Amino acid sequence: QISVRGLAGVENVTELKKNFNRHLHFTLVKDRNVATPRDYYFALAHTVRDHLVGRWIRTQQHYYEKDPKRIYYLSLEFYMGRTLQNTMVNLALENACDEATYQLGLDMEELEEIEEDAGLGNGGLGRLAACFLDSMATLGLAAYGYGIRYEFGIFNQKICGGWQMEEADDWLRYGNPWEKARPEFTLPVHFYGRVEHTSQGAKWVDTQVVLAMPYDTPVPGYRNNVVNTMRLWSAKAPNDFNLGYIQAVLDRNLAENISRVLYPNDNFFEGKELRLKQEYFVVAATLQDIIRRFKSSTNFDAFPDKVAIQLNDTHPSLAIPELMRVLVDLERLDWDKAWEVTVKTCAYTNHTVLPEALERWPVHLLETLLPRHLQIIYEINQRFLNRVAAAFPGDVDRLRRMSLVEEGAVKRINMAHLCIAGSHAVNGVARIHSEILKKTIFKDFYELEPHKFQNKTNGITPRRWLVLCNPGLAEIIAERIGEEYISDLDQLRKLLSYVDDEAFIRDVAKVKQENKLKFAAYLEREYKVHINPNSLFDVQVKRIHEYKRQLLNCLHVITLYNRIKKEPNKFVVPRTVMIGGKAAPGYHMAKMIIKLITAIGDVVNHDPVVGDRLRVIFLENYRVSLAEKVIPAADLSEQISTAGTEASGTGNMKFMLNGALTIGTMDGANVEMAEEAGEENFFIFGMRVEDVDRLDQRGYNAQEYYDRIPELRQIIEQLSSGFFSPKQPDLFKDIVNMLMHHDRFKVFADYEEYVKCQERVSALYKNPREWTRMVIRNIATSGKFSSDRTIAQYAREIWGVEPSRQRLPA
Amino acid sequence: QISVRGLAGVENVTELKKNFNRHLHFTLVKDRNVATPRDYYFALAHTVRDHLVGRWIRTQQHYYEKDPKRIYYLSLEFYMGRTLQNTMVNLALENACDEATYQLGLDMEELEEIEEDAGLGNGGLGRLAACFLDSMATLGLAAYGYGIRYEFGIFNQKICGGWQMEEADDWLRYGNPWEKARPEFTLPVHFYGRVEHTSQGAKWVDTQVVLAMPYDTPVPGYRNNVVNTMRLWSAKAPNDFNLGYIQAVLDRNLAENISRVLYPNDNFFEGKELRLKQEYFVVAATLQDIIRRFKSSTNFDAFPDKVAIQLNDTHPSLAIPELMRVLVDLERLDWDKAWEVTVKTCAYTNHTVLPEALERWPVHLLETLLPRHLQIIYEINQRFLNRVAAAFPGDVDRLRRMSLVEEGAVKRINMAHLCIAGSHAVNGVARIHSEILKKTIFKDFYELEPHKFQNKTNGITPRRWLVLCNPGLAEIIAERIGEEYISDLDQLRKLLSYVDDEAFIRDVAKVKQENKLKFAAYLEREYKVHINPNSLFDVQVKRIHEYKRQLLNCLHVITLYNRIKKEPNKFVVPRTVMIGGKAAPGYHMAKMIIKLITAIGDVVNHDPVVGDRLRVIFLENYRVSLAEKVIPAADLSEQISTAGTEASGTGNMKFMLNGALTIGTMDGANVEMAEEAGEENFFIFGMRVEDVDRLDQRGYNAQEYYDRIPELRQIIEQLSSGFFSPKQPDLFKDIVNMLMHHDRFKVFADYEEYVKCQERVSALYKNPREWTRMVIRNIATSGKFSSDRTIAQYAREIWGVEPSRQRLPA
């Protein structure tokens, strides 16, 4: 139907049709008379998977022969979403599969909606790892993603009586056709035990053993016939485990719980033993695999020439002392040489400066679970602090600040400090964030070793986040500038020569309108809600958090409502305000914010005086598959975190690529997006980082803003008095108390500038032609935010390997 | 190579070769350069499985159209063993697969040894269900086996220092290619809760829900293109189960433990809550499936015309009150009509008279777990006892004896009494056993309802237990009488015309010798043990139990040893005595017997004076796959249970079919085997049932036998004094104390007659021609013991359906 979806040749369609029928019969054991849509989905997935196999085997054989430097991306999270459409896109099979299923009497889009998201992450950090895997394959890098195969991913969110309820995400119930179990490559992982010191070194003995069984998932590059691997470990008890008899077998669950569930906290550290077990499990199993592959390529001097390990935050930080343990205790390298190898192999990416998100593990947990690792960490610390002392003699406070061991009531290990000491490179994820690291939390480290610190601004894959989710936009672009931009997104700059082209303006606007109609329909059918498709679609989708300031959005919505009620017969630009995101189950304030948003909806959406001028919708169960629907439909992207708190953001980039304008603070990558597009084509408001620092030095007093801004006082009085909760008038007192007396994120300080900036948005939306011209200027300068650009920078500046667009033969 | 293995046509071999390679590539994601024997096994299994699919779909569609009466065989145990060879045999693919793999450079026998046994049973009762499924398919019955898919089957037995150790049987680790998950047909099962009485009947409310997810396994008939289904249920937690957050997800294991492990007790009842949950789980899920299929065929009067439910012992006895519950509480049938339907639908097979094996559930467990069921059972009991009272007025002790409720310290429900009340037919499993039921434990029931009581003597499938395990024997038979006997085993009677044929005598003896050499080699390679292949192979393989009297065998072995030591230079017929079997993990005496057998081996096998005249081997990890190796190699089959204790036995029948002579008591089916072959062709010894009864009336005094039999006194003194345990002299005191003071099974009473009968065996073995002529007379009269004969009798006399040998079209 559309060009970018590839060719539908007769021979190819014929072959797909017969393989579909073959799988339905032999694989699924069904005939057409009793087959359901689910069976049809599975038959199509198996048919598409068959096309990955030859490329997968040949890619991995190619790495074996050529022996390139291998890149290992370690993460506790991979937020993959659905795989079927992505696979078709990357192998150029979408139009052929569409035609094949059409001829069989099936709608392929209907079949696509049956697939479960692979939800093995919380949000941005997990989704970054997934875009990175897509880019590494597209750039021909010999790359492996290593993680945990959680039985249960991020919970499914239900809203009941306006409140979040959680349900287990049993994503594997119907089977996962994309993974291949590899029980033959199962490896042992050790826990507990004790250290014995002998004549020939330390020995870690009396341990409990858990097995790590790998499942491999293919990761296709974009039309280059490269298929890399994501290897996810599953925990298994050994067969003699605990071996009355029945209890012993049932107690195998204690070992197997390690891979049962994803911790569901975004940007929040919870120091639980089970989480520490998960972190060591992935690290221990992965490093054995790395070393095996390296020996099957004595001379560990070449290890850093053949291996790069990238740590996605500190969560796999135990890779550093585990590598030292293997090299020292098992391979019998001297300490200094092992440390040299480790440092040159490891690199660390930091994704946050929020104190509560930083990993600081109690010494007593490490002492019990990983006694040899604690010893190694102590030794790392002593050697590091001897370097600090030599560089900064007499500076005793620096020694305390830089230590990997934090003193106090309970001693803890600072994992970020460990990562910096043991990595040859440390990066932040946007320019402003990387600057903050050098000026604030990692200042002392930067002074000691300035050469270690880098920036790598984040990106997103334009396969999933344009071609897959917005084929209509992708097509009208390819009509003008060809298809090369899909793997070289900087080519979107050529669209600037169309900003005055009347045909292009019309088409860009038509595609948004079509996306908005489709989304409005999806709402009605799947959630029985009726939105005005001519209204401005104002969207804030992301995890619920105080720092992301969904609360500031709420204050604006209430302001708009109150202004309408004051002057009902005055014209205002109609808005549909959509907010979605999951709250961590234990995060009380985030749960209260969800309830506030639905309560505002309950009042606003049923007030006859408002009509269809203002609607507020809470989008339930926000996840990767829902992002693919709502992002192409958005007009306005809300990116309104307190300056200094969002390390980068990536949702921001997805909206930019899909034809929404951004209202935002100068935070994370928003700064670079405004720089690329031009500040005139961005709706920037609020305190900069320097202004936040100034307020903090003076002392933030929320009462001042309440006292001076009548519209803000009205809202707080409505909240406190029970206007949005008539049957429970004190329901939102926690929210009010926080706003007035202990708001770390300064919601009131940005309120006036936010409201005024939102008026400017509404004014521009009244002029469709000029709205759309600004959109074209955003889409055209979105090229920098391709994760292909990001990964090429890691490759050249950290990993020491050259990217390639050259195709392997099929 | 051999005719009974079918044809190897070029087209067929060509197609198998290309499907093997296809599966290795696309299914396994391997190439030949890194593929291991395991991968090659899996590629062959998938190739063979593809041939089942069309036949499976067409068989089930045929039942849907024709709507025959359906037979549901409910069991907690299905001891299936390996599936690959059986499937090839039944589809006539063995020679073609042999040729195909030969041409690919592989040995198919090597590939066969990689497959795990499906060990979902303890021994005879579970293996009976498996032979029955094979016969039902071969006879064209519309039959379904329903059970539990245990994650862990019967434990793997290791012998360490002469003692049994248990290891979990993680049979699913590498995947099971023979099953198909059917998550779409998942059904809810209820537990706990309470009963509410309303205007319109009882309601069972406030229950906990566990889901039952079915996995289907095909069951091919022998060369008739029929493929029936074995449906096994797996327990799953609902997604809102227990829904801090992490604990709630981890606690899902509480629900899922129901299907985790097989209780490993043979002929012993253990009244544990988890076992009761397993029994209700299989019953509740199965009956919903039965009723669904019946409605998709209001009028439950036709239910018994369209459904037969066979209860494999009392373990699925809750089917009776569950069916009443559904009919009364849910379908709103009046009690009397529901009871009529239930009785006509259900039939019960009893497999034991041992008191400790009989299920008697505490009322307090049922009251908590299954409150509505207890109420229904009370009501069944009251109505039944009103019938007894009308039939036998004033006989108050009969009312107490017949009650389903047993009074005492703790009240219990007698499940056998429940089954008799609620079944239109009750059978034992061999003629002597069925007679004992009517004379002893079920006498009162037989007096009330004589028409209910039947016999169905057990059998074994001659596909697995001749053609598969002993192709050499199968071939030399088919040369003389053709191939029809494989599905009509009574045709073996034609072999009586060859008992004087010198060529046949030679061939029968050659095949045994070849089987013995092969087994002797298997021992050496897999267990480094060196046995004399010219010796008499004297074999007792079966679960370890006091009633089976492995101890009596031990006394004979020690007698033979002592007699050799007394007269070293006298000639005796060389013997290899092999004993194998698993002990239940909590059965202390059975564990002590294993240790005794290995301790006797330690002394005997290293005494230079004995040489290779006597060897004693304990065969580790006895299971279906090992039975298939050792049974064709045996000369003498030991079937020596105390008369009245082995309900039937089935190992006995396997040995008879495979050319061993039997030494045995007149117990279970041994009686009928002697009757078929002629008493002159059987080595019968010992007390009959009547003699055991006489001794019990007088009082069994073991001391009498000790006092009168010097050879027996010598053995006991050796045991007591530490002759077989020099470093722990009192090691076997428990065994001695039991033998002397509390032997329920009268080991000493049968000792003299056993030893004398064993002398007659040795005398006949010295004459190879006459040995072999007696063997031919056994093989020739083994026809009655085909499970095809058994199932035809159930079909005609219990289920009301006619068997068929007519082939469905392929």
Ligand SMILES: OC[C@H]1O[C@@H](c2ncc(-c3ccc4ccccc4c3)[nH]2)[C@H](O)[C@@H](O)[C@@H]1O
């Ligand atoms: O670089 C990708 C994204 O990483 C997010 C991110 N940083 C830290 C986390 C995090 C995620 C999961 C945890 C789990 C346990 C403990 C701490 C944890 C921290 N997540 C940032 O908020 C985005 O601005 C950024 O765009």
Ligand SMILES: OC[C@H]1O[C@@H](c2ncc(-c3ccc4ccccc4c3)[nH]2)[C@H](O)[C@@H](O)[C@@H]1O
């Ligand atoms: O009919 C097949 C075989 O059934 C065996 C058998 N009877 C009862 C059992 C049993 C098996 C498993 C349990 C588990 C729990 C409670 C009781 C349990 C009872 N097993 C008999 O011993 C054989 O003589 C007979 O050949």
Ligand SMILES: *Cc1c(COP(=O)(O)O)cnc(C)c1O
């Ligand atoms: C991109 C994405 C995120 C990150 O969004 P931010 O606005 O950068 O926090 C979170 N969740 C999902 C499902 C995403 O696709």
Ligand SMILES: *Cc1c(COP(=O)(O)O)cnc(C)c1O
């Ligand atoms: C046949 C069989 C049994 C039953 O043997 P008996 O001698 O009748 O107790 C037990 N276990 C296995 C593995 C079998 O094949």
